[PDB]
Amino acid sequence: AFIERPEDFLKDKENAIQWEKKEAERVEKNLDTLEKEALELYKKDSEQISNYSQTRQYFYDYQIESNPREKEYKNLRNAISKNKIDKPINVYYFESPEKFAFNKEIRTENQNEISLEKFNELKETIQDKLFKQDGFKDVSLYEPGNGDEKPTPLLIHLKLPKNTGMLPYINSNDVKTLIEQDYSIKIDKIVRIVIEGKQYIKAEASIVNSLDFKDDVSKGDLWGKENYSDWSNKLTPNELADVNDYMRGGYTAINNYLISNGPLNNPNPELDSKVNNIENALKLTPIPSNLIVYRRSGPQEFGLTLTSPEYDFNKIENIDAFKEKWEGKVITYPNFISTSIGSVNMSAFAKRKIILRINIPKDSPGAYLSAIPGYAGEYAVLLNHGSKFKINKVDSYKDGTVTKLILDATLIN
Amino acid sequence: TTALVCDNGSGLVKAGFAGDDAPRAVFPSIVGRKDSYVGDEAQSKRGILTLKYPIEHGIITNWDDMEKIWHHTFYNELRVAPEEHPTLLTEAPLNPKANREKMTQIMFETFNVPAMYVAIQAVLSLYASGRTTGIVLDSGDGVTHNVPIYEGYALPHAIMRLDLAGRDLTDYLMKILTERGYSFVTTAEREIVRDIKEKLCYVALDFENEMATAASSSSLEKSYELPDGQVITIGNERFRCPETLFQPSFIGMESAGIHETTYNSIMKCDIDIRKDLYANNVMSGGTTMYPGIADRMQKEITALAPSTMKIKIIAPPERKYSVWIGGSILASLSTFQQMWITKQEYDEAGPSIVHRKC
Numbered sequence: 033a034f035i036e037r038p039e040d041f042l043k044d045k046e047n048a049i050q051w052e053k054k055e056a057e058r059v060e061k062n063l064d065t066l067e068k069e070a071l072e073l074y075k076k077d078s079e080q081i082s083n084y085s086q087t088r089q090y091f092y093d094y095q096i097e098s099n100p101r102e103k104e105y106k107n108l109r110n111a112i113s114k115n116k117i118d119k120p121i122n123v124y125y126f127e128s129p130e131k132f133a134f135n136k137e138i139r140t141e142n143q144n145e146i147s148l149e150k151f152n153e154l155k156e157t158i159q160d161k162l163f164k165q166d167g168f169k170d171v172s173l174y175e176p177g178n179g180d181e182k183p184t185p186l187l188i189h190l191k192l193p194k195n196t197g198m199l200p201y202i203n204s205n206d207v208k209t210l211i212e213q214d215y216s217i218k219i220d221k222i223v224r225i226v227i228e229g230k231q232y233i234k235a236e237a238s239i240v241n242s243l244d245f246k247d248d249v250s251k252g253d254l255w256g257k258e259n260y261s262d263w264s265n266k267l268t269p270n271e272l273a274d275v276n277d278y279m280r281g282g283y284t285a286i287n288n289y290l291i292s293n294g295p296l297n298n299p300n301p302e303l304d305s306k307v308n309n310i311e312n313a314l315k316l317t318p319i320p321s322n323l324i325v326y327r328r329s330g331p332q333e334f335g336l337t338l339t340s341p342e343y344d345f346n347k348i349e350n351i352d353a354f355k356e357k358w359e360g361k362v363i364t365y366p367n368f369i370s371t372s373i374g375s376v377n378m379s380a381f382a383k384r385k386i387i388l389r390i391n392i393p394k395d396s397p398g399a400y401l402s403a404i405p406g407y408a409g410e411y412a413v414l415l416n417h418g419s420k421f422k423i424n425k426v427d428s429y430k431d432g433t434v435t436k437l438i439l440d441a442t443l444i445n
Numbered sequence: 446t447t448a449l450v451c452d453n454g455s456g457l458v459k460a461g462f463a464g465d466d467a468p469r470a471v472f473p474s475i476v477g478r479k480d481s482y483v484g485d486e487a488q489s490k491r492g493i494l495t496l497k498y499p500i501e502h503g504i505i506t507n508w509d510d511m512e513k514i515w516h517h518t519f520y521n522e523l524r525v526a527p528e529e530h531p532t533l534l535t536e537a538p539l540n541p542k543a544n545r546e547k548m549t550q551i552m553f554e555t556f557n558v559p560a561m562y563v564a565i566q567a568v569l570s571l572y573a574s575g576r577t578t579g580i581v582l583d584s585g586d587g588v589t590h591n592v593p594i595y596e597g598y599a600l601p602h603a604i605m606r607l608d609l610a611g612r613d614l615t616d617y618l619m620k621i622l623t624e625r626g627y628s629f630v631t632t633a634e635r636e637i638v639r640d641i642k643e644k645l646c647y648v649a650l651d652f653e654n655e656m657a658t659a660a661s662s663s664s665l666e667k668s669y670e671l672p673d674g675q676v677i678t679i680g681n682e683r684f685r686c687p688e689t690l691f692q693p694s695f696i697g698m699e700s701a702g703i704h705e706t707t708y709n710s711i712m713k714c715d716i717d718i719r720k721d722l723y724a725n726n727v728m729s730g731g732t733t734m735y736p737g738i739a740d741r742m743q744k745e746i747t748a749l750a751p752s753t754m755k756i757k758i759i760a761p762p763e764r765k766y767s768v769w770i771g772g773s774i775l776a777s778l779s780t781f782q783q784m785w786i787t788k789q790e791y792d793e794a795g796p797s798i799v800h801r802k803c
């Protein structure tokens with residue numbers, strides 16, 4: 033049909049395939065031997081390669097640089113990143129509902145219909161939520177129909193904006209499309225459709241970009257210094273002092289005072305002055321882009337101790353118990369709260385099992401304390417007292433033999 | 446004309462004269478809701494006053510109180526006039542730049558010293574044993590660091606810091622002794638248990654083996670006599686206490702243990718120098734004094750390192766003062782005399798002169 037592709041091929045399978053074939057031929061012409069080699073290894077070992085690409089960032093900097101799987105990751109990512117689309121395109125793929133924190137079956141595979149009750153439950157669960165996505169996946173340019181593989185009852189229909197890296201390629205008989213997820217998903221709408229005799233949920237999804245430095249702390253640090261150098265300057269006398277008193281403070285007295293309900297149980301002029309000065313220090317230069325930050329948190333933040341048998345996430349029951357307790361919930365820190373632009377593990381918190389991966393909207397109160405030399409090493413972002421975080425999703429991964437959790441969360445104030 | 450060396454710690458100040466082989470004075474780094482009281486003199490009262498430690502985790506956090514510590518050092522401990530002596534000060538690794546500046550300002554504007562210098566503690570330690578290349582494990586009362594050093598240069602990006610040291614070990618020993626059936630809870634009792642820790646604790650080569658032995662044989666039991674003749678018995682607490690260094694979860698901490706921070710620090714260095722670091726693991730500070738710590742560190746790092754790696758743990762008997770000793774040697778080298786910041790240089794450039802000379 034047309035001289036220019038649409039933004040969405042919809043059910044036009046045949047034009048979608050023909051088009052992606054030409055595009056695969058064209059793109060093959062721009063990949064070097066190593067990128068082609070990476071692509072070839074991907075076809076042989078896609079699942080493991082994709083798995084590695086999802087959790088890669090969470091280890092010691094030195095464990096990452098010495099994983100041999102890092103070559104395949106970087107080379108494959110360069111191949112994808114090279115070919116950026118010049119206008120939006122929509123894609124289709126199936127997900128498990130567990131992916132969006134719906135930890136039951138929408139329906140069994142043998143069932144043909146979805147209850148209105150499962151539908152409303154699902155809508156309530158996935159509504160008003162940014163779900164972080166990572167790693168390589170194969171997507172389709174057309175809506176699956178009679179005769180395509182349909183592994184789950186959940187079909188995602190995703191609009192990818194202009195400049196999304198996309199790698200069309202051929203594997204045996206098939207034309208495939210590879211992307212590296214590096215964004216959050218908003219589900220704008222769900223509808224129940226029917227394909228080949230069975231009801232499916234179709235999620236209309238769009239994308240929210242955030243700066244996510246992951247293990248590239250150097251890039252992260254450059255970025256932060258570059259945006260918060262002036263911040264050092266525009267601070268007043270007390271602010272600079274109270275913040276440094278917090279910084280090489282001090283946070284322990286302030287934060288216990290906050291946690292205790294001090295201001296409204298046992299007022300203190302000196303500390304109440306201090307809380308409000310720091311808050312005003314964080315309103316000074318609000319976060320100038322959507323930003324992912326990482327916090328390795330202590331079990332106490334989630335009502336556990338290091339000896340609680342519920343903190344043994346190697347037993348699947350305790351993961352489930354944790355999800356039921358926190359997943360979907362909002363969570364409030366009466367204290368000021370410390371995070372990093374980096375995702376890597378560190379000596380000071382090498383054994384903490386719970387990682388908060390927090391979405392910070394542009395203009396949120398907060399500061400890159402690490403532009404201030406001297407405690408600029410934690411690559412630290414300080415978030416305001418009383419901050420609330422919606423926990424969208426809980427994932428688990430293996431660090432050696434220890435299971436740890438990643439809490440996909442969002443700053444909602 | 447004789448330079449002073451003041452090694453300021455979280456728990457103790459070690460002070461003396463460059464050229465001496467030991468500090469002349471070692472005293473508590475404390476100041477007493479009626480004010481100026483310092484060291485053993487800060488026990489003028491633990492009543493109307495309570496004790497304050499101006500130095501926390503190796504970092505100066507109260508400047509008014511630190512000035513009192515230094516006043517006490519010059520006038521009461523060493524009995525010298527600060528105006529008449531160049532003064533070498535020590536600082537923690539990764540000490541904030543603003544801190545070094547503030548130390549410089551105080552020594553010139555408050556104490557009117559003719560010259561001074563700020564030296565990194567771990568570098569002085571390494572230097573005491575005649576080395577210029579090595580990785581230092583420095584563990585005192587407040588903080589422990591791993592500081593890799595190549596040809597006289599600390600490598601800051603590879604420095605590891607654990608806020609767990611002697612005072613946490615003392616508190617843990619109070620707790621598990623209390624769990625044994627004794628009662629150690631007061632500040633005076635904390636001092637008694639520091640003394641027990643210092644006399645009776647050791648690091649087990651194999652912790653789980655030593656634990657089984659304990660519950661069986663009783664040849665690991667030792668006795669200790671309290672100030673009023675009550676004699677008490679200590680068993681597996683002897684090695685459970687400093688085991689905390691290798692297993693900080695004992696104290697409810699989720700950081701790497703001391704062997705793992707040493708390995709992490711080495712892995713952050715250029716591959717080409719790692720052999721030099723493994724072959725030159727130097728220990729300093731009071732909390733490295735435990736019998737068996739060197740052997741245990743050897744075994745743990747062996748487990749982590751490539752099987753071909755030559756590993757050596759150097760633990761001098763004078764470990765506890767090696768920072769001080771290193772400062773005494775440094776301050777008296779002819780090639781160091783250039784490095785002193787004079788009062789004139791401070792008058793010309795400001796406090797920020799420390800960065801371009803220290």
Ligand SMILES: NC(=O)c1ccc[n+]([C@@H]2O[C@H](COP(=O)([O-])OP(=O)(O)OC[C@H]3O[C@@H](n4cnc5c(N)ncnc54)[C@H](O)[C@@H]3O)[C@@H](O)[C@H]2O)c1
Pocket residue numbers: 291326327328329330331332333334364365366367370371372381410411412413
């Ligand atoms: N990955 C990180 O966690 C991270 C990132 C950047 C900076 N930092 C820095 O680490 C230093 C201290 O460590 P920290 O901030 O991770 O620990 P912290 O001082 O925030 O917390 C200490 C203990 O209190 C608990 N806690 C904190 N808030 C709580 C609440 N609302 N309810 C119940 N328990 C609570 C924690 O679980 C932990 O056990 C700070 O100087 C900070 O700037 C840490």
Ligand SMILES: Nc1ncnc2c1ncn2[C@@H]1O[C@H](COP(=O)(O)OP(=O)(O)OP(=O)(O)O)[C@@H](O)[C@H]1O
Pocket residue numbers: 453454455456457458502503504584585586587588589610611612639642643644729730731732733734735765
């Ligand atoms: N023989 C010993 N065995 C075990 N621990 C000891 C021994 N001697 C001293 N200590 C401990 O070492 C600590 C003091 O050592 P040091 O003077 O190196 O620390 P500091 O410089 O005051 O503190 P930091 O270096 O942490 O700032 C105290 O906690 C003390 O109990």
Ligand SMILES: C/C1=C/C(=O)O[C@@H]2C[C@@H](CC[C@H](C)/C=C/C=C/CC1)O[C@@](O)([C@@H]1CSC(=O)N1)C2
Pocket residue numbers: 456457473474475484485496586611612613615632635636639
């Ligand atoms: C010989 C000696 C060594 C020493 O290192 O004391 C230092 C200094 C001391 C200051 C507080 C007390 C009451 C006044 C003490 C005078 C002390 C000289 C004591 O507080 C420590 O004890 C702490 C507490 S318990 C521990 O493990 N660190 C370390």
Ligand SMILES: [Ca+2]
Pocket residue numbers: 453454455566585730768
């Ligand atoms: Ca020290």
